[PDB]
Design a binder for this molecule. Structure first.
Ligand code: FE5
Length: 910
């Protein structure tokens, strides 16, 4: 009633469009999705109310843990005899006195064991309780919970203390962990119980295989096809039947008609049997122009494109009259068709519009049930009769060379081209493939999707297919794998083997591949929403990754509806997301005014305006007392306007400073510094920074302490976003204030016995960033986009473009004598040193480690193909890292290559 209205108003502000606009959408798929997705909402809420309050605190404050408890060789070695020193703080009776208790405990100690040990140290003063009954009422560890001093991170689950990301970091960085003992009932009360309500909208035949006919589609007429008559001669419609990025038959064009009258009334006949149409078959079309000639070949140009699914969300083969509002052709489209393009009708109806008719076979035609599929697969299942086609291998036919040949095929990278000889081979030996389940993505590409008999066989193999690694399953979710039985299996592996640490790690890819789903209601959307609604850390980024694309009409309906369902069931977080949403709004409206009206003024004038505009009551209210969209465990107190400045950088970003309202702010950072950028697409920087974190985690799990700085970066909208500020760090140029200038500065900041640890950090971070940038083909490095910390850690900022920004593999990070003098610790011939010898083997061991995990990076890039990212628009883009990692070459041939690239850029040494 009145409360539904408030909520409707609250969701409307969060997603950026009124809920009422979803109610007017006549599409049954839309209204069904809104109503039918509500069971995920119910289930998620029920799980939160299972063991209240704890159950609800786990949702709000989930454990920030690593996937594996096992501490690597070098990490366990930082512990003194396998024991970690921790500092526990108690806020005692006001004037809120902070009292510390320093403890030495095993790294595998559970938080409850730590609370007891802290109470044991605290009570030690009263020696009466020390000897007699050391217990102290079971040391009431159920009356207290651990919190991270300085931020809203809690230790609520029975995990070894070292498995917690904060504690593992503290071990690696040589920092003492400061924890705060906070009474259980004080957190539990701060949590308002959820009152999830069901919305008002929540109330409201023949089989395909019996149609012994060829497919046909009628192409009627086109409107809103406004064309300069003087240029174009004729216009025709190019059409094709696809399954993902692969055609099921040959592409059929209509007759050419004068552009003044786009009227065809033609029935287009295709090279495909109707029972032979796979589930994910789609019609792909475009309106093309043709003018010439100069006595040469005809100048074909695609005007606008569109794709329709041959079957609707209810498995119904689309029948009857239709209208498709076409889409503009994106720059550099090498084809007349756009199969990898978004499927569906353009929301703007003032765009070219193709009117079609599909066949009507006297009744509602539907895709057969699995019972009919299995009964046509068991129905599918001599010496010279099993050998009349290279797609059948009988019993007593499996060779030991074949077993190793299939094994060799499985090793090959995702972009490694399977030959047609190799496809017939994988298909004939499909039943052995179950022994090495990792072969599935290659085997699935060996299927002739245009054959019902072949596809039905594949469907049965997928049914009883051994689950694969979560990282391995993610490929089966890219554009290449449209089939629901395939994608459903991939979701099933993630549903089972994917940790919440890894879901947070790969969330952007998982949000992206959603655009490759045929329907609004699928197993991926349900998987992701459930995780978003049972973990508020995942939930936060699901919301922001989806909100940041609401300006993109290609996805705004899917995403809008997904955000509607999310906002109804997230609970209290909605009020906090709304605060962030309003904060970001005010920074966009303000940075817009500066860019449009005041760009041509002095820093002094611009700052005067900034300060005046920020001091306004409506502004001050919105921009203080909210959670950092970058890390929502960060409270952003009051603005420190005296520390807020417009940066001299390009797009003139705002450096913003907030107080940290935590009582233990001083034990983390007393002030939160975020950079607000308006003007650049922050999406490439999110992907690079994600890849850097992954490369770093790989090296750290092999015994390579090559420290990276994957700083926070979050795209919050259309070329607007947030950048984390790396505290106490300076660019190479702001160190030059000769050749020893850098080494001089580092040696100065790190004087004494702290010098030998600061040198190692430079050389190790340098080796990591040197290997990372080469492989990735990041934008060329200079004195301004290389930064150094007052401890020794080197890192890069502003990545620009990845892969081939040129359009024949570069070394973007070339080492100046400065960096090499720090490595060789002042040495004259920095080439022939014992220090550079230890640095060479760092770069070599780093490069080979990434080579081993090539298939993950290739996959993480392919999932991101859906994104409008100009440097990631084709599989020919991702192809770059297949060159840098020398995947065709051997492990020794690849090492020689890396040395040659470094040598032909640094002019020797290696
Ligand atoms: C040069 C100096 C002021 N500085 N600049 C940045 C910075 C600014 C914008 C960016 O856009 C992207 N993509 N990466 C960026 C990095 C920065 C930081 N993140 N931490 C510390 N100092 C920093």
């Amino acid at each position: 009633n009145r409360e539904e209205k408030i909520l409707n108003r609250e969701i409307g502000f969060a997603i950026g469009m009124p809920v009422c606009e979803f109610d007017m959408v006549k599409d049954p798929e839309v209204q069904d999705f809104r109503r039918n997705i509500l069971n995920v909402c119910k289930e998620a809420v029920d799980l939160r109310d299972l063991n209240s309050p704890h159950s609800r605190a786990m949702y709000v404050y989930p454990p920030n843990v690593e996937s594996s408890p096992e501490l690597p060789k070098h990490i366990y070695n930082k512990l003194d005899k396998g024991q970690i020193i921790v500092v526990i703080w108690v806020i005692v009776s006001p004037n809120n006195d902070k009292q510390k208790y320093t403890l030495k405990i095993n790294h595998d100690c559970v938080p409850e064991q730590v609370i007891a040990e802290a109470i044991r140290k605290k009570t030690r003063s009263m020696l009466l309780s020390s000897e007699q009954l050391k217990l102290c009422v079971l040391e009431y560890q159920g009356k207290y919970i651990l919190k991270v001093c300085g931020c809203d991170e809690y230790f609520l689950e029975k995990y070894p203390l070292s498995q917690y990301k904060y504690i593992r970091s503290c071990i690696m960085l040589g920092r003492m962990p400061n924890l705060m003992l906070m009474a259980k009932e004080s957190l539990y009360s701060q949590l308002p119980m959820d009152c999830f309500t069901m919305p008002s909208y929540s109330r409201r035949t023949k089989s395909l295989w019996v149609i012994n006919s060829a497919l046909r589609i009628k192409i009627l007429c086109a409107t809103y096809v406004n064309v300069n008559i003087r240029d174009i001669d004729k216009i025709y419609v190019r059409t094709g039947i696809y399954h993902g990025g692969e055609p099921l038959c040959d592409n059929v064009n209509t007759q050419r008609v004068p552009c003044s009258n786009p009227r065809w009334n033609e029935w287009l006949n295709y090279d495909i049997y109707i029972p032979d149409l796979p589930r994910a078959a789609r019609l792909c079309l475009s309106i093309c122009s043709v003018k010439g000639r100069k006595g040469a070949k005809e100048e074909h140009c695609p005007l606008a494109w569109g794709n329709i699914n041959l079957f609707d969300y209810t498995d119904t083969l689309v029948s009857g009259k239709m209208a498709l509002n076409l889409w503009p052709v994106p720059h550099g489209l090498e084809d007349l068709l756009n199969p990898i393009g978004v499927t569906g009708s353009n929301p703007n109806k003032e765009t070219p519009c193709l009117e079609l008719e599909f066949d009507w076979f006297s009744s509602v035609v539907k895709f057969p049930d699995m019972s009919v599929i299995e009964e046509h697969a068991n129905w599918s299942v001599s010496y010279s009769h099993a050998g009349l086609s290279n797609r059948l291998a009988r019993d007593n036919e499996l060779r030991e060379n074949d077993k190793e040949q299939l094994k060799a095929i499985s090793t090959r990278d995702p972009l490694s081209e399977i030959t047609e000889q190799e496809k017939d081979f994988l298909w004939s030996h499909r039943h052995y493939c179950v022994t090495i389940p990792e072969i599935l993505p290659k085997l699935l590409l060996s299927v002739k999707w245009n054959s019902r008999d072949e596809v039905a066989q594949m469907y049965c193999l997928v049914k009883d297919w051994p689950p694969i690694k979560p990282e391995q399953a993610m490929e089966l979710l890219d554009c290449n794998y449209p089939d629901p039985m395939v994608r459903g299996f991939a979701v099933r592996c993630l549903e089972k083997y994917l940790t919440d640490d890894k879901l947070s790690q790969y969330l952007i890819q998982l949000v992206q591949v959603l655009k490759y789903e045929q329907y609004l209601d699928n197993l991926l959307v349900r998987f992701l929403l459930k995780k978003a609604l049972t973990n508020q850390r995942i939930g936060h980024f699901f919301f922001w990754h989806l909100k940041s694309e609401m300006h993109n009409k290609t996805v705004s309906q899917r995403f809008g509806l997904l955000l509607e369902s999310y906002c109804r069931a997230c609970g209290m977080y909605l009020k906090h997301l709304n605060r962030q949403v309003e904060a970001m709004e005010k920074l966009i409206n303000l940075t817009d005014i500066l860019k449009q009206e005041k760009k041509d003024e002095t820093q002094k004038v611009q700052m005067k305006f900034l300060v005046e505009q920020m001091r306004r009551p409506d502004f001050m209210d919105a921009l203080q007392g909210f959670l950092s969209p970058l890390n929502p465990a960060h409270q952003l107190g009051n603005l420190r306007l005296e520390e807020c400045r417009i940066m001299s950088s390009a797009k003139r970003p705002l450096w913003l400073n907030w107080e940290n309202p935590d009582i233990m702010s001083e034990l983390l950072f007393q002030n939160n510094e975020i950079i607000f950028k308006n003007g650049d697409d922050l999406r490439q920087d999110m992907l690079t920074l994600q890849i850097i974190r992954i490369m770093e985690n790989i090296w750290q799990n092999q015994g390579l302490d090559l420290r990276m700085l994957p700083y926070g970066c979050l795209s919050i909208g259309d070329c607007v976003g947030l950048i984390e500020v790396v505290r106490n760090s300076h660019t190479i140029m702001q160190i030059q204030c000769n050749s020893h200038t850098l080494h001089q500065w580092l040696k100065d900041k790190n004087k004494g016995e702290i010098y030998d640890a600061a040198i190692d950090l430079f050389t190790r971070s340098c080796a990591g960033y040197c290997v990372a940038t080469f492989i990735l083909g990041i934008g060329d490095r200079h004195n301004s986009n290389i930064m150094v910390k007052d401890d020794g850690q080197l890192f890069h900022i502003d990545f620009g473009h990845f892969l081939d920004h040129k359009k024949r593999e570069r070394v973007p990070f070339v080492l100046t004598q400065d960096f090499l003098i720090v490595i060789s610790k002042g040495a004259q011939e920095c080439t022939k040193t014992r220090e550079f010898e230890r640095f060479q083997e760092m770069c070599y061991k780093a490069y080979l480690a990434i080579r081993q995990h090539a298939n993950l990076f290739i996959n993480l890039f392919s999932m991101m193909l859906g994104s409008g990212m100009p440097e990631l628009q084709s599989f020919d883009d991702i192809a770059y890292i297949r060159k840098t990692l020398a995947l065709d070459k051997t492990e020794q041939e690849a090492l020689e290559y890396f040395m040659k690239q470094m040598n032909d850029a640094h002019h020797g040494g290696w």
